[PDB]
Every structure is written in C-alpha cells, then in structure tokens.
Amino acid sequence: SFRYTNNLIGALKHRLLLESSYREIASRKFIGNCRGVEVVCSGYGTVLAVQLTDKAVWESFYRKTGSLDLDKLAESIKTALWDATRKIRSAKEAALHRSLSHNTRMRASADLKHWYEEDANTLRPLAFEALKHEAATPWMQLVQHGKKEEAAALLKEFEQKGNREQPPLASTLKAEDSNPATIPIGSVHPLFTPALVQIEEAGGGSVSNEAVCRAQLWELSRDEQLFWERVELIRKGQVASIGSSHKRGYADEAA
C-alpha cells in the first residue's frame, strides 16, 4: 500500500538535493594549478582566467634573455585546466554521494545501480551547456532558474528606466537559492520541465492549488460518467441474459 507515493517522495528528495547542488556548484570558482599557472573555471567548466602566480619564482622556469618554451607552458596550462575540471566533477559526484547515503527510501529498494546511474558526465552543471546559461542576461538567468518574481521585477525596471574573477552565475544565484526549500517545482526535475511547469503558478514559483484541482476535477467528471455508462450496460446485460431482474441469494442468506 502506498508504494508509489512513498517511492516518489524518496525520488524527489533525491532530485531536490541534486538540484540544490547544481545551484551551489554553478556559482563558484575552481582553481587548477600546475607549475606557477592558475587556471580558473566557473562551475560550468568555462575558463574564466589564466594567470601566473609568483612571476618572481616561475618566470625563468619558462625562460622568457631566454625565449619562451611554449611547450612547457602549454603542458602546464593543459594540466592546470584538467585539475580544475576534475575538481568540478568531483564536487558534483560528492553531492550525489551525500544524497544517496542519507536517503533512506532510495536505500529501501536495494540497488547498487543508484550509485552508478548518475555520475559526473550525467549530473548538472553540464559543460557543453555552459554558453546558453552563462552568456545569458541577468534577466534570462533569472527566468532560466525559475525565479519568476525577480525576473518580472527586473523586467519592469528595465522598461521604466528606458579578466574579472567571478562566475557569471554568482550574480543571479546567491546563497539562499541553495536551500532545497526554495527550488520551484518547475525547475526540480529538468528532464520533465515543460510538463511540470503547468502545475506551477502563473507568476509564483510555488505550485498552484487551483490549477492542479482544476485538472483533477476535469478528469474526475469524465471518469464518473464513464463509470455509470459501464454500470448501465453491465446491468442491462445481466437482465437480458438472465431474463428477469431477480437473482438467487447465496446458500448462506437463508439464516
């Protein structure tokens, strides 16, 4: 009994945590370093800066009067970037792991596959999706992450009035949006976003009782009528085949 609701609650606890994690990692810096070289990536894996720390120390390593290696330099850049990226991926997987280890409903179904079915490749933020999320305007980022309130606000103020270190998303996504309490239902399970958007309120991120009840009430109406149609026919079939509207009782209805 209640297998479906309970398994569902488990699964959505999982989703909320992966989502909250996505929003933490997305706005954040990751620094790879190799030999004096600091590559700085956003959570989305996008290279923000390529710097040399301690020019005093490291400059003669690459020569410069000496001519630059550009081979050593290339390898160390490559390596630094790889390091940063690997930090990102590990952060994602970490989030996944904390979730699995604390989620008892998902533990109930005994599945080793829960641990492998979503990994660094699979989880968000996705690197090949960086552009559309990062290159986006502050307004666009707001609507992308499902904050309709602040996006509408920003839009009205937009009309009426008409190497840097920081991930482009640390503007729109602040600390408080890591709270899984805040995450709108539209955004929770990205795979299904276009369907789960209709459960949502027209302006507010929170689910609308009215819309959902409307939707249910429609189907209930239809299904009620179907029920009586079928009852009608089954009864008429009974009376037809039996020949009369009467039936025997059971041997036990004598007492």
């Binding site: 009430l217 109406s221 009620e224 009586w228 009608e232 009864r235 008429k236």
Partner: peptide
C-alpha cells in the same frame, strides 16, 4: 441527478471546465 431504468444516481464531481 440522473434517473434511469437501471439506477437513480447523483453525479458528484460533475464539472464545467
């Protein structure tokens, strides 16, 4: 409310979309 040969019943949940 619907009365028929078979049943006198009452729709709950009847609704106008």
């Amino acid at each position: 409310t619907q009365h028929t040969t078979t049943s006198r019943r009452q729709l709950l949940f009847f609704h106008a979309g």
